[PDB]
Coordinates of C-alpha atoms and ligand atoms in Angstrom, one line a residue:
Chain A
X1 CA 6.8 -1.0 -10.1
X2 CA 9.5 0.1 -12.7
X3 CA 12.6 -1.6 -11.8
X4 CA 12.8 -3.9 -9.1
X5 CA 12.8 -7.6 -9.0
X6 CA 10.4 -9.9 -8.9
X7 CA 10.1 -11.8 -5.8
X8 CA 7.6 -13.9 -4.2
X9 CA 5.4 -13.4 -1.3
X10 CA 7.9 -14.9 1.7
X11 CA 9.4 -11.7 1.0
X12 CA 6.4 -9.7 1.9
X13 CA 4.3 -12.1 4.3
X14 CA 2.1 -8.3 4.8
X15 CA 1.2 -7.7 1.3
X16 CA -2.5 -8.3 0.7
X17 CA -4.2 -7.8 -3.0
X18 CA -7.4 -6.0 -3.1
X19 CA -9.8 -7.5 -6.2
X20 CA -13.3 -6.1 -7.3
X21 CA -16.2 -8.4 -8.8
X22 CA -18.1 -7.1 -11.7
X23 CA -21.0 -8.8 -12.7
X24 CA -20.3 -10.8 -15.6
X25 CA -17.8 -12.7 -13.8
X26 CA -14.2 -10.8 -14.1
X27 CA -12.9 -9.9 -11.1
X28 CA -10.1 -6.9 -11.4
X29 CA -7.2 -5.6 -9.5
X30 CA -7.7 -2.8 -7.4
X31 CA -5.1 -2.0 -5.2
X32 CA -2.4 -3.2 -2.8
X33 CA -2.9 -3.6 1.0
X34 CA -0.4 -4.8 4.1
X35 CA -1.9 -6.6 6.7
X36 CA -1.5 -5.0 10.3
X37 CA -3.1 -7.1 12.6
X38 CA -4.9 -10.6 11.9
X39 CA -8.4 -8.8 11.3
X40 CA -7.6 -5.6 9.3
X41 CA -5.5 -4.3 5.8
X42 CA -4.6 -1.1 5.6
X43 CA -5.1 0.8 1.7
X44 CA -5.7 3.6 0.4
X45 CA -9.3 6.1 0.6
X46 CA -8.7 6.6 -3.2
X47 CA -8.8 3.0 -4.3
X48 CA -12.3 2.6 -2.9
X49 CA -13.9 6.1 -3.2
X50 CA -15.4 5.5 -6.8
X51 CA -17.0 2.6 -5.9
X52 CA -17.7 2.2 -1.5
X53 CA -19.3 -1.1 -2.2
X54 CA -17.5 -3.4 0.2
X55 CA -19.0 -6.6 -0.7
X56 CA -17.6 -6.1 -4.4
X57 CA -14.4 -6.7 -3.4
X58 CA -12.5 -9.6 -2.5
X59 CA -8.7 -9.7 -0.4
X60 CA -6.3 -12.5 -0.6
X61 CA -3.1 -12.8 1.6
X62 CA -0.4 -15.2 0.7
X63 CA -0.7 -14.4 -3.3
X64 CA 2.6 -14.1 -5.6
X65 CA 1.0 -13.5 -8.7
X66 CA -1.9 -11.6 -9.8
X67 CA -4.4 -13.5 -11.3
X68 CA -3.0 -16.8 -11.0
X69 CA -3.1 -18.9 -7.0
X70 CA -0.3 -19.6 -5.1
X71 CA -0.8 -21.9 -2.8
X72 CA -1.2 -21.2 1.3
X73 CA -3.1 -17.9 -0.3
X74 CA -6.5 -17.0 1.7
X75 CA -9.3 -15.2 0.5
X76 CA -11.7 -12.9 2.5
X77 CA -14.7 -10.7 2.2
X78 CA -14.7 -7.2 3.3
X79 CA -16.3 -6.8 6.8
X80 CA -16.1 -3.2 7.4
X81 CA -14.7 -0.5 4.7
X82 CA -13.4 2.3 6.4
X83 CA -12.6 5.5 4.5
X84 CA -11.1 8.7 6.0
X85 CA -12.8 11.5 6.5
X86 CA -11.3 14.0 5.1
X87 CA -10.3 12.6 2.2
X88 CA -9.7 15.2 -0.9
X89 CA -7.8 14.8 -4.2
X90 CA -6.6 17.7 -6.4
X91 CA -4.8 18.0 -9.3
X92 CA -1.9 15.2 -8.5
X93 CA -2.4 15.0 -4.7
X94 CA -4.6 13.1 -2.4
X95 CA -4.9 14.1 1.4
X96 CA -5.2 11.7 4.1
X97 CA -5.3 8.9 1.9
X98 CA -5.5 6.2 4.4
X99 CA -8.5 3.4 4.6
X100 CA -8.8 0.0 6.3
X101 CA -11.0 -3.1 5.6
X102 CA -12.2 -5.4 8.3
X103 CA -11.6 -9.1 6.6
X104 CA -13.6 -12.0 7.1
X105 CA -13.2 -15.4 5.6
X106 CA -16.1 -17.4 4.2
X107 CA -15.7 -19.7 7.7
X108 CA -15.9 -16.4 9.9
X109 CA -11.9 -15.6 10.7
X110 CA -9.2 -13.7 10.0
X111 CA -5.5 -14.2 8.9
X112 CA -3.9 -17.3 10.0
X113 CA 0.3 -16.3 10.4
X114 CA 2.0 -18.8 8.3
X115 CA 5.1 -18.5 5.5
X116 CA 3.7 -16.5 2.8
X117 CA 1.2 -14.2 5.6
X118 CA 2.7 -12.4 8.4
X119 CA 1.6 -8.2 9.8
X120 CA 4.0 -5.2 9.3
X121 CA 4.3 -3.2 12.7
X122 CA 3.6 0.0 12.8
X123 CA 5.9 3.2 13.3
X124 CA 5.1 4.9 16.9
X125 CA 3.2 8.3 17.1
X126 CA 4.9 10.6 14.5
X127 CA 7.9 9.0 14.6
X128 CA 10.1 8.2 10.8
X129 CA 13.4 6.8 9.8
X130 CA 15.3 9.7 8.1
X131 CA 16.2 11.1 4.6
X132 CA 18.0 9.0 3.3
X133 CA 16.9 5.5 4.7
X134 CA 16.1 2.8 1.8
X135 CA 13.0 1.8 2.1
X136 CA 11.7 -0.9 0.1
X137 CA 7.6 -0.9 -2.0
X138 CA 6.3 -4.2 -3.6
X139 CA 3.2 -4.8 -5.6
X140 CA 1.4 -5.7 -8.9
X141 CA 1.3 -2.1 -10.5
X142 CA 2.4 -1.0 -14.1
X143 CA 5.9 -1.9 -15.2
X144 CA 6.7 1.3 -17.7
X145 CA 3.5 3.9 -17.6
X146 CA 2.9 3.1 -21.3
X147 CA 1.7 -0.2 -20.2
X148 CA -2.4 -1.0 -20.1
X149 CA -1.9 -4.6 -18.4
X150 CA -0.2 -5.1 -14.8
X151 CA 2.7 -8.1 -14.2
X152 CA 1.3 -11.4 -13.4
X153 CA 4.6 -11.9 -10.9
X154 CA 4.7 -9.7 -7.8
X155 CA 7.3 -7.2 -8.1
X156 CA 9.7 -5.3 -5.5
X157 CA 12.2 -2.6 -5.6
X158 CA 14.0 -0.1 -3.3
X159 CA 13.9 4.0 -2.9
X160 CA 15.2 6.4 -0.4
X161 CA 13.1 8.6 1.5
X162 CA 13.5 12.0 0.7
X163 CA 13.0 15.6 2.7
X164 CA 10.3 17.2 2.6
X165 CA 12.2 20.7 2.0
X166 CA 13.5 18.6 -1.1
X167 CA 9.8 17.6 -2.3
X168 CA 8.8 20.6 -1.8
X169 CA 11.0 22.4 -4.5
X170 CA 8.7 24.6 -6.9
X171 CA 10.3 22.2 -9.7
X172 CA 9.3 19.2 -7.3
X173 CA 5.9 19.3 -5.8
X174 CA 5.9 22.7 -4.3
X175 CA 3.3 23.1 -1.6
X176 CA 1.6 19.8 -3.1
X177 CA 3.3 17.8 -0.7
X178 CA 2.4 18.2 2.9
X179 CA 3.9 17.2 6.5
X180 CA 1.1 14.0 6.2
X181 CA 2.8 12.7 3.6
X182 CA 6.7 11.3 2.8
X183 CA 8.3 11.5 -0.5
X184 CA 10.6 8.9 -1.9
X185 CA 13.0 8.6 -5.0
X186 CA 15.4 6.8 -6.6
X187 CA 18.6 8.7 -6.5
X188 CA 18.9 8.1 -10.4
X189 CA 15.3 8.1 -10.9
X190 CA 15.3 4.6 -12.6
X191 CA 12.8 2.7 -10.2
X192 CA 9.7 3.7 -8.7
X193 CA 5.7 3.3 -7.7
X194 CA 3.3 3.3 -10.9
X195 CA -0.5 2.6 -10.9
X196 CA -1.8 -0.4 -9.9
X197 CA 0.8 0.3 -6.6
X198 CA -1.8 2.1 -4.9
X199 CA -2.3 1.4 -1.2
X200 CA 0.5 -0.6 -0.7
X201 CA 3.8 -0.3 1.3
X202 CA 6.8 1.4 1.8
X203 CA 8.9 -0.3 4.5
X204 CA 11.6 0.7 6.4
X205 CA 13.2 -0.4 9.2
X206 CA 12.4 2.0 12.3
X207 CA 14.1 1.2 15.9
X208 CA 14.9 -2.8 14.8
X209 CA 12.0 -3.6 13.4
X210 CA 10.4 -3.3 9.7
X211 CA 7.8 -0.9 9.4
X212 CA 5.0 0.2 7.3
X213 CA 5.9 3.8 6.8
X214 CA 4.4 4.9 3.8
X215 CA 1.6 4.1 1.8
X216 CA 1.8 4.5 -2.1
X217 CA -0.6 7.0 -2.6
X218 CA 0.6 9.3 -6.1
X219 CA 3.1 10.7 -8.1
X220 CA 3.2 12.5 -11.6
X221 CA 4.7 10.3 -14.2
X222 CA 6.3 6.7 -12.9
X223 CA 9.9 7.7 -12.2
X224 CA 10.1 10.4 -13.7
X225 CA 13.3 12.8 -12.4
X226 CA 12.6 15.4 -10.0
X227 CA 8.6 13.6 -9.5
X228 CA 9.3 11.1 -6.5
X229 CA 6.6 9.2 -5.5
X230 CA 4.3 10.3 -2.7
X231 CA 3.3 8.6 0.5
X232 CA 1.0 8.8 3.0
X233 CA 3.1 9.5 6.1
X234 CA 1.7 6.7 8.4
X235 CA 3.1 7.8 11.8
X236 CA 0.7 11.0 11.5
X237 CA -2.1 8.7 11.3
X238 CA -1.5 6.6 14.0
X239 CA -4.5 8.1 16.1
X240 CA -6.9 7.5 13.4
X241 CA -6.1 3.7 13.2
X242 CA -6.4 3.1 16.9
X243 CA -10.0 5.0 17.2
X244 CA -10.7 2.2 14.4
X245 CA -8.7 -0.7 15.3
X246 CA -9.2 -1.1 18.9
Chain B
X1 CA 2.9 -19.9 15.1
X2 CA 1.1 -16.6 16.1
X3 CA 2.5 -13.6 14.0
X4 CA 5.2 -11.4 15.0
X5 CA 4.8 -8.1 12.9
X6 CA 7.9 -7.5 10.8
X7 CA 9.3 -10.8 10.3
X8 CA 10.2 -12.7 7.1
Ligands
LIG301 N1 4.0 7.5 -9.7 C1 3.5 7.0 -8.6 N2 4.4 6.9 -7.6 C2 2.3 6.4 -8.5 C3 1.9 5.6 -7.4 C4 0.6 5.0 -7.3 C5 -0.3 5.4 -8.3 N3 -1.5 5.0 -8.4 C6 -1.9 5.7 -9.5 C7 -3.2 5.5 -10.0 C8 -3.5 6.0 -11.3 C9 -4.8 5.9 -11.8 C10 -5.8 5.3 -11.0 C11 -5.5 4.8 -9.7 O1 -6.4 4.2 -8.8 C12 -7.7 4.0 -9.2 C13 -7.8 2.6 -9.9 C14 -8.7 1.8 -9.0 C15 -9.0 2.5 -7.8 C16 -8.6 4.0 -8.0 C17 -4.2 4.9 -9.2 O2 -3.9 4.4 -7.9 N4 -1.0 6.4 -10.1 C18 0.0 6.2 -9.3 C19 1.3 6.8 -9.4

């Protein structure tokens, strides 16, 4: 995230870390994840696609820093890996970049709710907040883009959701940007998603309650002006979970 | 408790 704060994980009970084992004993960061019900974390299709080996990688809930434990932090194996069908990148964008993992502890459960794990809801069929709504991201990605490392301290930071008819600007995204996904900025451009963000969320707050309504999926640059950061518009996708998570 | 999507 560039920009933001840092903040610990009672601030975002949902997030989940995604690690992969390599053999030789390093385990790396992978993505981000938010937990929607006690059994499955919802990603991103492009942060397993080069590599759909679920039992290489590893999900802990309840972690405020990256490599690091915090304690009350759970760890589980990957049950079931679903990727979407559908799934395509091009030169920047990513369709239908949506996945979810089935967790299982080492003991056979799930999530247990406590302080530091809680689930996000989810929006209602195709419904958002509007333009303009601050939403808020959080995860372990790059702090500038010149960086090769990732912060060790969870990170947070706010951005507005943007329209699609401004997205969509030639000197935006153009036709890049589709009606599946959500666009979001910083009004000054100063803070925003950046690798290592990847499949985690953008919440906002949607009739009461805070929802998962983007995932971070790309963007050119890290906050870069007139380059928001792309999203995959969760309440188009809504069908697809259910037909999984049922 | 039991989880209650949504809150801190
Ligand atoms: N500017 C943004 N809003 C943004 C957000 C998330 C990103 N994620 C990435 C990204 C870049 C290189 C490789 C990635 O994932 C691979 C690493 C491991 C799995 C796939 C990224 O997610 N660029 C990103 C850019």
């Amino acid at each position: 995230i560039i920009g933001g704060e840092f903040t610990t994980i009672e601030n975002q009970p949902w997030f989940a870390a995604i690690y992969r084992r390599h053999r030789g004993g390093s385990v790396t960061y992978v993505c981000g994840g938010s937990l929607m019900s006690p059994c499955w974390v919802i990603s991103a299709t492009h942060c397993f696609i080069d590599y759909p080996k679920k039992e290489d990688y590893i999900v802990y809930l309840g972690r405020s820093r990256l490599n690091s434990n915090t304690q009350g932090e759970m760890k589980f194996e990957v049950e079931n890996l679903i990727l979407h069908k559908d799934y395509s990148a091009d030169t920047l964008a990513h369709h239908n970049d949506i996945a979810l993992l089935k967790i299982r502890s080492k003991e056979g459960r799930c999530a247990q709710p406590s302080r530091t794990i809680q689930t996000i809801c989810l929006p209602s069929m195709y419904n958002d907040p509007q333009f303009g709504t601050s939403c808020e991201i959080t995860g372990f990605g790059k702090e500038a883009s010149t960086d090769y490392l990732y912060p060790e301290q969870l990170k947070m930071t706010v951005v507005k959701l943007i329209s699609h008819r401004e997205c969509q600007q030639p000197h935006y995204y153009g036709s890049e940007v589709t009606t599946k996904m959500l666009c979001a900025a910083d009004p000054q451009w100063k803070t925003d998603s950046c690798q290592g963000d990847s499949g985690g969320p953008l919440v906002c707050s949607l009739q009461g309650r805070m929802t998962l309504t983007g995932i971070v999926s790309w963007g050119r640059g890290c906050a870069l002006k007139d380059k928001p950061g792309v999203y995959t518009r969760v309440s188009h996708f809504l069908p697809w979970i259910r037909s999984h998570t049922k | 408790l039991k989880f209650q999507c949504g809150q801190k």
